[PDB]
Write a protein that binds this ligand. Sequence first.
Ligand SMILES: Nc1ncnc2c1ncn2[C@@H]1O[C@H](COP(=O)(O)OP(=O)(O)OP(=O)(O)O)[C@@H](O)[C@H]1O
Ligand SMILES: Nc1ncnc2c1ncn2[C@@H]1O[C@H](COP(=O)(O)OP(=O)(O)OP(=O)(O)O)[C@@H](O)[C@H]1O
Ligand SMILES: [Mg+2]
Ligand SMILES: [Mg+2]
Lengths: 384, 881, 394
Amino acid sequence: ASKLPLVTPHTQCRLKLLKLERIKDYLLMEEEFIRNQEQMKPLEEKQEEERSKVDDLRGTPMSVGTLEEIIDDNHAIVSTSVGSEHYVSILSFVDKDLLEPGCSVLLNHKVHAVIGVLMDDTDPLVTVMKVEKAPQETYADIGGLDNQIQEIKESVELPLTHPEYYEEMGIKPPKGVILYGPPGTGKTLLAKAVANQTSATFLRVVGSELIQKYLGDGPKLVRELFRVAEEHAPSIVFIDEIDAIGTKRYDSNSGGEREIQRTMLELLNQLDGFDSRGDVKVIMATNRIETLDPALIRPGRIDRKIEFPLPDEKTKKRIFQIHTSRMTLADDVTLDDLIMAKDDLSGADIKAICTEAGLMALRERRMKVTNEDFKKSKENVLYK
Amino acid sequence: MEEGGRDKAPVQPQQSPAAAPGGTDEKPSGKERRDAGDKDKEQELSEEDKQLQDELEMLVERLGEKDTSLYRPALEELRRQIRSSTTSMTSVPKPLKFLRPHYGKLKEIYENMAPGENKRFAADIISVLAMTMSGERECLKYRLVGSQEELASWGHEYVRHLAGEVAKEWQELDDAEKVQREPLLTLVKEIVPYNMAHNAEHEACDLLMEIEQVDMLEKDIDENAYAKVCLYLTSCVNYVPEPENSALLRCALGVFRKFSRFPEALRLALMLNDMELVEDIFTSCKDVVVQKQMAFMLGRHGVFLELSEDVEEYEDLTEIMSNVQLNSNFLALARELDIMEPKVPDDIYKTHLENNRDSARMNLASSFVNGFVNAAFGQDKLLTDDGNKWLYKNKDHGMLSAAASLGMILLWDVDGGLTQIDKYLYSSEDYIKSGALLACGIVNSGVRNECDPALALLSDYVLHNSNTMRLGSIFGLGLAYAGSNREDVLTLLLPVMGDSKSSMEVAGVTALACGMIAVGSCNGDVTSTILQTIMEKSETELKDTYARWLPLGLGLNHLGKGEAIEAILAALEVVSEPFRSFANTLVDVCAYAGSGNVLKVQQLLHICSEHFDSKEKEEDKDKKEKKDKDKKEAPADMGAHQGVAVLGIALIAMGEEIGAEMALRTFGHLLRYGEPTLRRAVPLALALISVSNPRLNILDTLSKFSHDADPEVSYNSIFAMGMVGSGTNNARLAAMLRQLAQYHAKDPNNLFMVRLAQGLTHLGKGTLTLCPYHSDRQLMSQVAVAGLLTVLVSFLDVRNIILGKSHYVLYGLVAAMQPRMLVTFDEELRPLPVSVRVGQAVDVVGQAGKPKTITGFQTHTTPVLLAHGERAELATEEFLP
Amino acid sequence: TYSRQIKQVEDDIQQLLKKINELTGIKESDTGLAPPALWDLAADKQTLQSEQPLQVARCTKIINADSEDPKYIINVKQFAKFVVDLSDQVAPTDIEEGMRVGVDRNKYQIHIPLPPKIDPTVTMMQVEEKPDVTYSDVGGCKEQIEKLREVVETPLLHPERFVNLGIEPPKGVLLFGPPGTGKTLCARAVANRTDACFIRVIGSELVQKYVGEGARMVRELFEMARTKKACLIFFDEIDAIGGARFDDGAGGDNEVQRTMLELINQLDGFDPRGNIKVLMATNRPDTLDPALMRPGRLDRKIEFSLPDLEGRTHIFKIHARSMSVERDIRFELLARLCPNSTGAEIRSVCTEAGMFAIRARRKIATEKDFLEAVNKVIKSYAKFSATPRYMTYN
Ligand SMILES: Nc1ncnc2c1ncn2[C@@H]1O[C@H](COP(=O)(O)OP(=O)(O)OP(=O)(O)O)[C@@H](O)[C@H]1O
Ligand SMILES: Nc1ncnc2c1ncn2[C@@H]1O[C@H](COP(=O)(O)OP(=O)(O)OP(=O)(O)O)[C@@H](O)[C@H]1O
Ligand SMILES: [Mg+2]
Ligand SMILES: [Mg+2]
C-alpha cells in the first residue's frame, strides 16, 4: 500500500537492505500486536461475525434511490424511484466518501434508510468514441512527408515519453496542433499513425455530428465530451473536418444559424476557459481553413499550424514503391510512365489505381499484372 | 540452431583438460604448455565486459569440473609454475560453476594460495571476474573468520591487502558510481572493526582523486543516518578526517560533527573546536561556523573562544554574544516590518463577518490574539487596552499569563525590555510581578547577557514565602539560561527545589527549569531530585502533578546519549513499586532522542501491549506511548510512515484508553510539516464528537490540530469548526482552544520555526523547550490552575525561518539566488538531478520555503559554505572569462 | 551479490503484509462497505437506537395557515392534500407559509422545517475552489487592475471609510477588448484573491431545450446568491445571451430575449439585489443591448487595449524569467520588432524559442533563437490572425 517509495538505491547497497529489514521487523511487530487481541480478547470471530451481523441488519431486498441533498450530521433527502422523497438517516458502515448528489444509493425496504452506495454502469457515449486497438503500422508506412512528422512528434509524443528535456529549460510544451491542406494528401493517415504509436486513451469525433436537432443540445454534447476526456487519464482528442459545421446547412436543425454560434462559443470556452485544463491534447484537421473563426485559432488555443502540400515526383515514386510492395507485379510494367499520367495527382489516386488494377486482374483468375490492366485502370479511375 | 564445426571452444579447451589426467604424468612440457594456452585463451576471452556468456568460462565445467576436482586436490606434487596458471584460472569460473551455496567452498581453489598479481588480468573488469569472488570471500568466509577468530591463518593476513587492491582498482577504470560500491566490500569486511578499515582506506582516498571525495562524503552521511551502536561510533568518528585530509573544505566540519559530538565523546567535540580554531586562515569560515553555535545546532560554546588575539577574528565570538543578536533584531525590523508586516494586524478573529449568515475566559484568548501576531518587536502602545483593563478584574492565572505574554511580544530583545516591563511591574500584586518577571526572562532569551542572572529574579526568589512572585521567578530565568551550563545558577537554584517546603508547584517547576539548563554532568542534582522524589512520592498515591514534573528534570539531565549506561544507572537507582516506578520508562527513553533502536521500540510494547487495562496502569501505558512517540522526529524519512501506519492500525482502530484519549498527541511530536494524510486523519477523528469518551480529551486533540505553522489555504476548514463550535462543544472548555488553534496557524506570520531539524538532520536541542508542552498537556482539565500561564510561553524556542541573505562585511548585496525543491540525489549516475521545481526564481530575503533548497547563479560558486549553514556569506569571484 | 536473499526477503515480507491485511479484512469485494475497523461502533447501540427512535418523516410543502388556534394545509406531489396540526416540540413562530416541512407517515403532523430547492445544475456553479494566478502575473495593464480592484475587493475589506463618507460604491463592471488580451486571466486573479463566494457562469449555459427555462435558472441563481451575506457573480461571454430586441417577420431569437429581460429585471427595480456585485467580460461589445449598458447595472467600462511598448518588455520579462538563457540578451529590441501584438503571441514566442534550442542539442538558448522565433510566429503565421478585424469590433 505504497509503504516506502524511497528505494532509489535499487542495488545491493547496505542502505536498501537495512531499510527492508527494518520494514520487515516493523511489519512483524505490528502483526503480533494485531494478532494478540484476537488470541487474548476475541469476544467475536470478527472475520464473519461482524459480516453476519451487518447482513442481518440490512433486509434481503434493497432499492435504488437518487440523492438530492445531504446534511453533515448523517442524514439526507433521497428521492425514491417513483419520485416522492423522504428524510431518512445514514448508517455508519456506508463509508461516507462517495456520497455525491446524483449517485444511486441502496436504501432499506422498510424505513428507507441509506445502507449502501452503488457504482455506476459506464455510458453509451464512451463506447461510441473510445478507440480500442491500434489500427495499422506506424510512420514507416507514410513516406514523402518526413518533415512535419518531427513536428507532430515534438508536440504529442515527446512531452509524454521524455518529460525531462522541458523541465531543464523550464517551458510548457506547445498546446494545440492543426493540420491543413488540399484533400486527399495524408492527414488522417498521420493521425492513425499517432494513434498506433501512442499510449494514452484516444478519442475521435467528426465535426459533422456536432450539430444536433434540438435547442441547447450542442453545448451539452461538447461539455460531456471534454468531461469524459478529462476524467480518465492523459488523453488525446481528435476532431476531424471542423469546417463541416460552417459549410453545410441542414433543415433538421431546429434553430437557424445562431445555435451554431452558441456551439462555437462553448467550444472556445472549453479550449481556453478559466478552469484548470489539466492534461489533454487537441488535434484538429481540415481542408478549408479560410472560413473558420480566427478567434478559434489564436495562439494559446492552437499553437502549431502544419501545411500538407501536393506530392512531388520523388514522393510519387516512393508511394508507388510502397503500394506495390506485396503485389506479384510482372517485369513488363514501369512506374515512370505512370508517374506523369496526370499532372497533379494526389496520394489517393495511387492507391485507387493499384486496387482497381488488382481487381481487374482478379476477374480473369490470374496472378500477374500486365500493362494493359494499368492502362485501363487509369482511364476507369480518372476520366469520367 | 547449429552445432559443431564452429564449436571449437567445447572441443579443444575441453579435450586438453580431459587429457590432463593422462598428461599430468610422463608429460612435463605439455602439462605447462596446455595449461598456459588455456589460461591465456580464457583471459583474452574474459578481458571484455560485454560477452558475459563466455565460450570457455561456461563450457569448461561440463566435463572439466571433475577434472579440476582431480587436478588441484588430487595432484599432491604442486610446483611453482603450474599453480600460477592453475589457481588464477580456476578461481574465475568457480563462482558460477557450482550451485547456489558455493560461498562455503572457496578454499579448494583460491584460499589455498594467491598466485602473484591476478589483478593484472582483472583490472579491465569491474564486477565479474574476481571482485565478485572477493565480495563472496568477504561476505561469509571472512565474516565467519572474523566473528571470533580475528587472529587466524592466511585468511586474514594477506586477504586485507587483496581487499585494499580491489578497492583501489574499483576507482581506476571508469570511476563511475562503483566508488559507492567500494564501501559495500569495505563495510562487509570487518563490519564492527570498521575503524582500521577506514584508517587504511583514508590514505588511499586522499591520493585517489579530489572530486571523487565529495560524493563519497555524501554517501557516508547517507549511511550515518542509521547504524549499529558500535558501527555508528566507528563510522561517525571515521568520517571526520575525510573533508580535511582528502578534501580541503575546512568549513563543513563543525556543522557535520554534531553526530560525532554527543554520541562519540564531548572531548571529540572539544578537539574538533580546537582544530577549527587552529585552521583560522579563511577568517570567514570561522565566522560562519561560530554564527550557529549557540541557539542553532548546539550551545554553551562561549568558553573556548577567549584566546590571546581577540581582536577581530577570535573576538568574533563577542559579536556572536549579542552583536549578531542585535543584527538579527535589526534585520527583523528592516526586512519584515518595512516590507509587509504592520505593527498590529490583530484581525484573524475579526474576520467574523462571514459567520453571521460574553465570558471573560475568551478575553484570555484575546491575549493570544495580541502576543502571537506581535512577535519580533511587535511592541504596541495603547493597543493593549483589553489586557490593561482585565489585568485587575478577574482570572488571576489569566492576568498573570497576559502579563507574561508581553515578553513573547518582545522576542529576542536586550535593549529596553525591562524598561517597558517597569511600567506595569510596580503594582504589588500577587501575579502581576511574577508574570512581569517571566516576560523579562522571555525577552532576554538567547541573549545570555548580564541583564539579570541573580539581580532581578533572585531578588523576588529569595522571598520564597508567596504563592506567586516565588514560583513565577524561575521559569523566565531558566528559559533565558536554557542553553548555558553555568553552575552558579545551578547552585543558586538547587536549594529552591531542595528546600523541602510546602510549595509543591514551585518545586515541580524548579525541576523543569533546572533540567532544561544542564544535560551532562552534575550528578548532585540527580541525587537531590531522586531523594526528594523518594521522600515525597513513596508515602502517597496522589495525582500525577509530580510524575510529569520531577522525572522530566532527570530526563533533561540525561537527554541525548546512546550509551544506555545512564539509563541503567537511573533505572536501578529508583527501583520500587510500579506506581513508584513511574519513571522507569521516562529516563530510559529520554536518552533516545534520535537514534535507531527498533529492538527497543518493539520491546517497549513487549512488556505490556494492552493487558486489558483493568484500570490499573493507565498512566503507565500512557507514558509508554508518549515515550514511544520518539524516533519519529528525524527517522531519516523512513520510520515515520511505518510509525503512523502502526498508530492508525493499532491505537485508533481498537483500544481502551490509550487509543481513544491521547493517541493523537503523537502527531504533534510527529511533524509540523502538514500533509493531507494527517490533515484528513485528524479531521476524521475530530469532526465527529462521540460524547461516549472523555470529551475533554478530544478537545485536547483540537488544541493540536493546528500545531503545524506556515499558514495554507485549508485554514477555512478550522473556521468551519468554529461553526460546529458555536452550539456544540461548549465554549467554557473550548473557546480558548479553538481561538488559539485558529491564530496559531498565522502566529508565525512569515517567521516560523517549530520543527527542530536544521541543515540536514541535526535536531539542535529545541526538545528541551518543547517536550514540556506535550508532557503537560496530558490532561486539559487542569488548565484552571495555570493553563494560561504555562502555554503563554512554553514554546519560546522560536528561531524564525529567516536565514538566507547576505551577511557580507558591508552587507550591500541583497539577494541573487533561485529557489527550488529539495536537492538530494542518489548516485544512479554521476551527473545528478534533484530539484524538480526550477520554475521559481526570486531575488529577495523573504521566506525560504519549508521543503525548499535555494541555489545561486551569476558565477558566484559559493566559496564560503557550499553545503549548509542558513547564513550563506555569498563570496564573490569571477574567475571565468 | 546476495540478490537471491534480498529478493526473497522482500517477496516474503510482501506476502506477510498481504496476509496480515487479509487477516484484518480487505477481501470480500465491497458494494459500498467501509473498512471493518471503522464501522465497529454501529454494532450494538445504533442497530437498536438509530432504527426505531427515528422514522422516515415525509417531506411536504405547506400552502396556508388558518388563523388563531391553527390548522394547516399540506401538499405532497403524488398523494393528496391534508388538514393537519403541529407537535409539542415546534413553536408556531418559525413555520411561515411557503416552506418545505417534515410530516409523520401515519398521523400526518408537522415536525421540522427544511431549506428550499436549489436545482443541482445550478448548485454546481459555485467555484468551491480557487485557481493559482496572482496580480503579480498580469503585467502590462496596471491601470485597469487598479481600477477594478478599487470596486470589487476594497469595499468588502474595509467597509468603514465609505459608510462614514456617505458614498455608495458602484456595483457592476464590464471588461472588453480584442481576443487574447487578459480579461479571463484578470478574472482568475480576482477569484484567487477574494474571500466571499465566487459563482462562475458561462453565457452559453443559459440556452435550454424547452420554453420558459432560462428565466427559472436566473431566478434560482439570484436566490442562492441572496442566501449568503455578500458575494460575487461572474458572467463570461455575454455576447451569447443577448444582443438586442429586433423581432421582425417570423418570430426568431425570441426566447433568448425573454431570458435577457429576466436578467435585466433581477438587477434593477423594486428593491434591487442589495449586497451582490456582478462582473461581466466580453469580446465584441457593439452588439450589446442598450437597456443593459445603462449605468446602475454596468457602472464601469474598463477597456483592454494592445500593449504599447513598456507592456511588451514587461510581458517578456515575466514570461522568460524561469528558463536557462544567455546572460546578455536584450528584450527591448524584441519589443520594438513586434508593433501590434498581444500577450498570447509573446508567450508563444518564448515557448518556440525554447523549442528551437531543444531542437538541436543545446541547453541554453541564444539571441539567434529568439530572432528565429520572432521571424516565424509573428511574420509567417500572419495569414491567421484575428486582430485586424476585431480592432473595429466586428
Ligand atoms: N503521403 C502519403 N503516403 C502514403 N499514402 C498516402 C499518402 N497520401 C495519401 N495516401 C493514400 O491515400 C489515402 C487517403 O488518406 P487520407 O484519407 O487519410 O488522406 P487525407 O488527405 O487526410 O484525407 P481527407 O482530407 O479527405 O480527410 C491513404 O489512406 C493512403 O492510402
Ligand atoms: N498582460 C498580460 N500579462 C501576462 N500574460 C498575459 C497578459 N495578456 C495576456 N497574457 C497571456 O496571454 C494569454 C491570454 O489569454 P486570456 O485567457 O487571458 O484571454 P481572454 O481575454 O480571455 O481572451 P478571449 O476573449 O479571446 O477568450 C494567456 O496565456 C496569458 O498568460
Ligand atoms: Mg481525413
Ligand atoms: Mg476568456
